[PDB]
Amino acid sequence: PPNLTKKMKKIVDAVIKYKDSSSGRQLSEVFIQLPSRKELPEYYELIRKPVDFKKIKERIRNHKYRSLNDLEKDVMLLCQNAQTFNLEGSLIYEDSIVLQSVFTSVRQKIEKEDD
Amino acid sequence: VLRSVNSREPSQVIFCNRSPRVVLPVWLNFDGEPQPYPTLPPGTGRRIHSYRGHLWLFRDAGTHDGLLVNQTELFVPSLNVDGQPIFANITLPVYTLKERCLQVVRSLVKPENYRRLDIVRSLYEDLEDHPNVQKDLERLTQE
Amino acid sequence: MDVFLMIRRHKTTIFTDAKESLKRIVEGILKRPPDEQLYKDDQLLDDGKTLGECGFTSQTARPQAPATVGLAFEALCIEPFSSPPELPDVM
Amino acid sequence: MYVSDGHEFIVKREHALTSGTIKAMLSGPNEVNFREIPSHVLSKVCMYFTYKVRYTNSSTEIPEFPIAPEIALELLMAANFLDC
Ligand SMILES: Cc1ncsc1-c1ccc([C@H](C)NC(=O)[C@@H]2C[C@@H](O)CN2C(=O)[C@@H](NC(=O)c2ccnc(N3CCN(c4cc(-c5ccccc5O)nnc4N)CC3)c2)C(C)(C)C)cc1
Ligand code: NA
């Protein structure tokens, strides 16, 4: 992993800065910092492995991701969490689905165009 | 001792920076603790997603001078009636000419050199005592 | 609106404020008739109390930096003030 | 109603009331002289006086009171010696 982190950075940097085409909102801001235990006890209990981006940001910093395929299934787990806690069709729900295909479409561009 | 209430009830809020400083929005973590949020250019304003009952404190991001929001010391998001985002007008106070003269001096000399002025031995205390975040908290919490 | 100005005459000076649209106030304070008076930058001003028409809009004659006006039957250079020391610790 | 290295200046009485020290010399229990302060500092002082009243508790977007760097040392001792 010589610049493996450097490419994970771009990937996460791109997903967060994603803007809706009609609304323009950053569409990732709900998921940035997950509220605390004292302040949301029912999330941490219903959800097996809670995760938000701040943890992924600093998990990348510890470079505990051996692979990009490793990095994906965390960001994948992140939306899979929000899809269970939230109602099908709720704003948060339908957006976690969007970012799934945002991380999808972004992984292809980064890996190739840098050898 | 002084922090935000955990009502999950949201509150669309918007900060209008109507002052020449660079404003530093400060959220108060539920342990009384302050957490900082991105700075605001002087003329501009920005919309936010805050939650009702929370506490916001406002402050220059460079001198940490006392900044005024909505004409009062602090700002708590009320409920937005017709969806109208609540306005946190971040403006200046009217400092005492003593205080205003204090800020300009801190801007022109480094701390390792304050004491070399040929000025009153009292003002040295008044200079070396800088405007602080948590310090102003103990002052507001006191009664 | 409200314009804040500054009249000087041989180092004696008045701070007061009036509307964007005169000297009569001088007669009450200086107890000298108003017609004997009054200009800026060598351009007397006859028709008094029209304030703005000369350049004193609500942004130039503001409290933290008032606008200078002179007073006259004699012409005079109102005596300026002292100069700053520029102590060397700063900068 | 109204009131070189001395005072020599006239302002409204209420604008004078701004400073706490000058709420003491006159009307105790007119003219007032200052044997320390120059004539260039008293400009920026009574400018703060007018700047104080017009803007205090007026919800309008308050602008800064300005200070030239070559003036700071001597206004500060003043506003210290003025309780304002
Ligand atoms: C000021 C400023 N200038 C310039 S830019 C800017 C600015 C700063 C911050 C913000 C963010 C967006 N906004 C806040 O910072 C607000 C402003 C302050 O009042 C407080 N605040 C907080 O964020 C704190 N607290 C809470 O958010 C909190 C508390 C109690 N309950 C809460 N809920 C119930 C559960 N929710 C759900 C979450 C998820 C989910 C999330 C992540 C990953 C997976 C998931 O599944 N999924 N589904 C949900 N339903 C969320 C809402 C939230 C903080 C502790 C998190 C920092 C925006 C703009
Ligand atoms: Na957030």
Residue numbers in the entry:
A (entry chain H): 1455 to 1569
B (entry chain C): 62 to 204
C (entry chain A): 1 to 21, 27 to 42, 44 to 78, 85 to 103
D (entry chain B): 17 to 19, 24 to 49, 58 to 112
Lines from the paper:
Targeted protein degradation via “hijacking” of the ubiquitin-proteasome system using proteolysis targeting chimeras (PROTACs) has evolved into a novel therapeutic modality. Herein, we characterize PROTAC-mediated ternary complex formation and degradation by employing von Hippel–Lindau protein (VHL) recruiting PROTACs for two different target proteins, SMARCA2 and BRD4. Inducing proximity between a target protein and a ubiquitin ligase complex can promote the transfer of ubiquitin to the target and subsequent degradation through the 26 S proteasome. PROTACs are constructed from two ligands that are connected by a linker. The nature of this linker, length and composition, and the attachment site of the linker to each ligand affects the affinity of ligands to each of its binding partners and the relative orientation of the two proteins to one another in the ternary complex.
PROTACs (1-3) bearing a common pyridine linker differ in the way the ligands (SMARCA2 and VHL) are positioned with respect to the nitrogen of the pyridine ring. A drastic difference in the ternary complex binding affinity (KLPT) for these regioisomers was observed with compound 1 promoting the highest affinity complex. PROTAC 1 demonstrated robust SMARCA2 degradation within 2 h in the MSD assay (lowest AUC) while 2 led to a right shifted AUC (two times >1) and 3 exhibited no degradation. SMARCA2 PROTAC 1 demonstrated the highest cooperativity (α = 12.8) compared to its closest analogs 2, 4 and 5. Attempts to solve the ternary complex crystal structure between VBC and SMARCA2BD with compound 1 was unsuccessful but we obtained a ternary complex crystal structure with its paralog SMARCA4. We modeled the SMARCA2BD ternary structure with compound 1 using this crystal structure by substituting SMARCA4BD for SMARCA2BD and performed MD simulations to relax the system. The SMARCA2BD-Compoud 1-VBC complex appears to be more flexible than its SMARCA4 counterpart. The three top models of compound 1 induced ternary complex from the modeling workflow are all within the structural ensemble generated from simulating the crystal structure derived SMARCA2BD-Compound 1-VBC system. Increasing the linker length of the PROTAC (i.e., 7) could cause greater conformational freedom, and could impart flexibility in the ternary structure, resulting in reduced total BSA compared to compound 1 which lends more structural rigidity to the ternary complex.
